[PDB]
Design an enzyme around this catalytic site. Structure first.
Site, PDB file in Angstrom:
ATOM      1  CG  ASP A   1      -1.892  -1.107   1.336  1.00 56.52           C
ATOM      2  OD1 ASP A   1      -1.756  -2.084   0.571  1.00 56.52           O
ATOM      3  OD2 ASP A   1      -2.787  -1.058   2.217  1.00 56.52           O
TER       4      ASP A   1
ATOM      5  CD  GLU B   1      -3.845  -5.283  -2.525  1.00 53.98           C
ATOM      6  OE1 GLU B   1      -4.816  -4.927  -1.815  1.00 53.98           O
ATOM      7  OE2 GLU B   1      -2.716  -5.561  -2.056  1.00 53.98           O
TER       8      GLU B   1
HETATM    9  N1  LIG Z   1      -2.529  -4.903   0.214  1.00 54.32           N
HETATM   10  C1  LIG Z   1      -3.691  -4.701   1.113  1.00 54.32           C
HETATM   11  C2  LIG Z   1      -4.655  -3.638   0.501  1.00 54.32           C
HETATM   12  N2  LIG Z   1      -5.938  -3.629   1.260  1.00 54.32           N
HETATM   13  C3  LIG Z   1      -6.962  -2.709   0.753  1.00 54.32           C
HETATM   14  C4  LIG Z   1      -8.304  -3.305   1.232  1.00 54.32           C
HETATM   15  C5  LIG Z   1      -7.939  -4.616   1.938  1.00 54.32           C
HETATM   16  O1  LIG Z   1      -7.712  -4.375   3.358  1.00 54.32           O
HETATM   17  C6  LIG Z   1      -6.625  -4.927   1.250  1.00 54.32           C
HETATM   18  C7  LIG Z   1      -5.796  -5.936   2.033  1.00 54.32           C
HETATM   19  O2  LIG Z   1      -6.524  -7.176   2.037  1.00 54.32           O
HETATM   20  C8  LIG Z   1      -4.399  -6.078   1.371  1.00 54.32           C
HETATM   21  O3  LIG Z   1      -3.591  -6.993   2.124  1.00 54.32           O
END
Ligand SMILES: N[C@H]1CN2CC[C@H](O)[C@@H]2[C@@H](O)[C@@H]1O
Length: 851
Positions: A422, A494
């Site tokens: 992220d 993702e």
């Molecule tokens: N890389 C993260 C990004 N998140 C955005 C929404 C969700 O919580 C997802 C995670 O599953 C994931 O592990």
């Protein structure tokens, strides 16, 4: 001399019961009541192994585990025999969560200040402490907090393991060698653009751990060519030996599955001292080139061996409690191929070596990297879980990059390493990662984030994390208009439409009757088997759209049947859209990682295949989409599109598209003949289905692709509505877009009964596998298709034989039509039963035939 042996197992106990830490590793230490565990166990895995708590995969069993006991250390203890102390002795290991003291024969050889972080490798010279006969080693393993420790955590995928995975999840190698230890042998490999010549640069470290200066010769073979270097080492000296370039003509290039073979070469080296072998190492490498660059639209575009590729994949996860089994790893990767996928993403939880070996052997591409939402990003993610870094965190994170770069550099499956998920790392942390990789000669593409966040040095990510992660209707995927959303454009790192209800057989193993009653009656209620996150705690968005689009559920069976239809339809469109848009001149889709490929446990969301390897509507949906030669219907503009995934252009194809009302009346027919379509994701348009007068509210579109020899190569049946799904775009959250209007597919509720039609036979192969063949025919006296017909290899009690691989399944057949299906599985997984096939269809009921 040249030995490396995994410790096969340990006995474990809480440090609550150990008052003298030094006593543990003295030979003769009593262990009455300690728990025997195999290698690679977390504490809780080890306690399950001893049957100490009930099955965490069922209901809320996992809540009934007292977690306080895992807020102190646990000891991992084993004897090790040494017949001769001529050789030096080393403990070489990684996978300690979170950190540990290491003890040998009553002496502390390392502390948790040094032995710290799951990914860090340690190579401990325990020669001084080892004596002739019985020796003992104990690890005091400290508790794991994924927000505090550079370790592993479960984000919002499942529910928290009671022990937070503390323990030793990879092997500890006992190493034996002479004066010189041989480490970190790798091969730098560079393919020319023609793919017919490679240059190999072998590097390997020699460490003289003896008291005296030595001459060592490091010699052996790379790719069947002899090599030799002789260097001097001062006492305690470590050197890197670079061997002269070796040319390799017309190499057996490693390819992704379906593009060629998966050949890997061997490197085999022995460090000798004084005409005698001192240490030795065998490894493999693949000759292959990979690139991942930003296209002109700012999209991250991968290529292997000069070939551009639409990444089509899912996020892989290991077992919730990190229980390792090689065969299962292989089954999991084999399913990736059965799906038609080419890639798996690993958001952290990076698997043990063998997983990459298997990936290599099968030709599945992998995208490892660090994970979001805990310590790894604690210094850049602000308000999200994960603690800001202190000074001691830096060298651990850098050592973690180096260790992984080192483990991973020679596996041809690996196409990149994500250094953030992220959040991109900041400049200090990123420089730490780049330096580590440089030092390991890890030369693969480095992606700064999986979101659109750039890093200071590497720059743009070329990807997006805009969601969704919960219910959206099919047509959402076809959007290119909303640049803060998860439509088919750029690289979708993702994303999914959330809830994925598993098969009724998995359901009944994972939840009680009451739990399942609640699920269908009250989707709004919290389900332990979705997520610990409040956001993904329940099935409300899913339940709501299910009722709206397919009609209210009359009972559990009704809910499940509709659940599967919805998941098939949704996952199908998610991939198909990304396949179609891959060849857009402007903002092409360059990637799709479904969220997720599998679950760490028994679950209700974010999976194609369940924890028991059963296959549901979501699985079959991903599989339809990813057919190598494929026909698809676009939900946005009603164009019929042919996708060729193969490594060769195809000619002489005909695309047949037919629409049927639910009474069986054909309302439209179109046959487009003589279609060509290029290789590797290219497309062709057959026709745009016009608006047709007089379609039933819910109708069917039958899409058939036949090659020049007349073989049916792809069949694709869509249940569609005269009433559109439309989005309330302005109501979008980060995890979904709500709908301003819903499609009406409820007509399926009253689709008339048809019939099938089944014959089956099995051959037990000499390779340990059985192939069950099944012939299905629609045998009805009318006009009605046998719609969504699911075939299942079952034993004599009717329990599914898993894992299983079908060539095709979840079929629809018109009156008279026939299909022959093939299922393959290990003969041993029958467990002595004769095979049968259970055949159930939306409108044909359930039967089981012997096979
Ligand atoms: N890389 C993260 C990004 N998140 C955005 C929404 C969700 O919580 C997802 C995670 O599953 C994931 O592990």
């Amino acid at each position: 001399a040249g030995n490396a042996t995994p410790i096969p197992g340990y006995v474990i106990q809480s440090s609550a019961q150990v008052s003298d830490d030094s006593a543990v590793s003295k030979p003769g230490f009593p262990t009455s009541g300690w728990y025997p565990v195999s290698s690679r166990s977390t504490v809780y895995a080890g306690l399950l192994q001893n049957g100490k708590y009930a099955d965490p995969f069922y209901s809320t069993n996992m809540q009934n585990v007292p977690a306080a006991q895992f807020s102190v250390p646990w000891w991992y203890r084993t004897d090790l025999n040494v017949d001769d102390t001529s050789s030096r002795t080393y403990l070489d290991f990684s996978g300690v969560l979170s950190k540990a003291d290491v003890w040998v024969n009553g002496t502390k050889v390392a502390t948790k200040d040094q032995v710290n972080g799951a990914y860090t490798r340690h190579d401990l010279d325990i020669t001084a402490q080892v004596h002739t006969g019985v020796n003992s080693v104990a690890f005091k393993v400290y508790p794991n907090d994924p927000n505090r420790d550079l370790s592993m955590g479960w984000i919002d995928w499942a529910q928290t393991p009671p022990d937070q995975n503390m323990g030793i999840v990879r092997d500890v190698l006992v190493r034996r060698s002479g004066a010189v230890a041989l480490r970190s042998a790798h091969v730098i490999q560079k393919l020319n653009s023609a793919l017919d010549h490679a240059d190999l640069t072998v590097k390997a470290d020699v460490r003289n751990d003896s008291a005296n200066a030595v001459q060592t010769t490091v010699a052996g073979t790379v790719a069947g060519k002899p090599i030799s270097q002789t260097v001097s080492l001062a006492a305690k000296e470590r050197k890197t030996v670079t061997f002269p370039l070796v040319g390799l003509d017309r190499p057996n290039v490693w390819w992704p599955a379906g593009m060629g073979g998966q050949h890997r070469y061997d490197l085999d080296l022995t460090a000798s001292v004084g005409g005698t072998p001192s240490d030795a190492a065998k490894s493999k490498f693949g000759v292959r080139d990979v690139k991942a660059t930003l296209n002109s639209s700012g999209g991250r575009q991968y290529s292997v061996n000069g070939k551009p590729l639409l990444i089509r994949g899912g996020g892989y996860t290991p077992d919730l409690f990190l229980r390792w089994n090689e065969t299962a790893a292989a089954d999991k990767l084999k399913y990736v191929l059965n799906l038609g996928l080419n890639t798996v993403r690993l958001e952290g939880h990076i698997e043990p070596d063998e997983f990459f070996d298997i990936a290599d052997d099968l030709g599945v591409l992998t995208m490892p990297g660090w994970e979001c939402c805990d310590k790894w990003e604690g210094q850049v993610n602000g308000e999200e879980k994960g603690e800001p870094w202190v000074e001691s965190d830096y060298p651990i994170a850098k050592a973690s990059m180096f260790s992984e770069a080192e483990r991973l550099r020679d596996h041809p499956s690996v196409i990149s390493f994500h250094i953030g998920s992220d959040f991109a790392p900041d400049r200090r942390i990123e420089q730490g990662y780049l330096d580590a990789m440089k030092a390991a000669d890890f030369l693969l593409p480095v992606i700064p984030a999986a979101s659109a966040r750039p890093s200071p040095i590497t720059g743009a990510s070329g990807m997006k994390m805009n969601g969704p992660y919960d219910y959206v209707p099919p047509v959402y995927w076809y959007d290119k208009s909303q640049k803060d959303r998860g439509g088919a454009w750029s690289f979708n790192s993702e994303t999914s439409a959330g809830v994925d209800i598993p098969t009724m057989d998995t359901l009944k193993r994972m939840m009680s009757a009451s739990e399942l009653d609640t699920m269908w009656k009250n989707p709004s209620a919290k389900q332990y088997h979705r997520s610990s996150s409040d956001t993904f705690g329940n099935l409300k968005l899913f339940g709501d759209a299910l009722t709206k689009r397919y009609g209210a559920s009359a009972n559990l069976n009704d809910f499940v049947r509709k659940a599967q239809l919805s998941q098939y339809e949704n996952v199908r469109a998610e991939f198909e859209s990304h396949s179609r848009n891959y060849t857009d001149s402007t903002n092409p889709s360059t990637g799709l990682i479904y969220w997720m490929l599998n679950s760490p446990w028994t679950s209700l969301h974010w999976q194609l295949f369940d924890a028991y390897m059963d296959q549901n509507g979501a699985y079959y949906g991903a599989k339809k989409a990813n057919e190598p030669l494929h026909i698809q219907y676009s939900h946005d503009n009603r164009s019929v599109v042919v996708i060729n995934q193969t490594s060769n252009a195809v000619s002489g194809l005909t695309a047949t598209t037919k629409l049927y009302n639910l009474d069986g009346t054909e309302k439209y027919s179109n046959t487009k003949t003589g279609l060509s379509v290029g290789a590797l994701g290219a497309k062709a348009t057959a026709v745009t289905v016009p608006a047709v007068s007089g379609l039933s509210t819910t109708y069917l579109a039958k899409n058939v692709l036949t090659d020049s020899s007349g073989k049916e190569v792809s069949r694709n049946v869509y249940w569609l509505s005269t009433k559109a799904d439309t989005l309330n775009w302005g109501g979008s959250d980060w995890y979904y877009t709500p709908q301003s209007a819903f499609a009406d597919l409820s007509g399926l509720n009253n689709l008339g009964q048809s019939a099938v039609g089944a014959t089956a036979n099995s051959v037990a192969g000499a390779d340990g596998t059985t192939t069950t063949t099944v012939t299905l025919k629609n045998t009805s006296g009318g006009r009605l298709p046998a719609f969504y017909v699911d075939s299942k290899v079952v034993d004599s009690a009717g329990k599914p034989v898993l894992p299983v691989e079908w060539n095709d399944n979840a079929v629809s057949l018109w009156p008279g039509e026939t299909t022959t299906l093939t299922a393959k599985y290990r003969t041993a997984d029958l467990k002595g039963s004769k095979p049968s096939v259970r055949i159930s269809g939306w409108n044909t009921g359930t039967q089981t035939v012997p096979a």
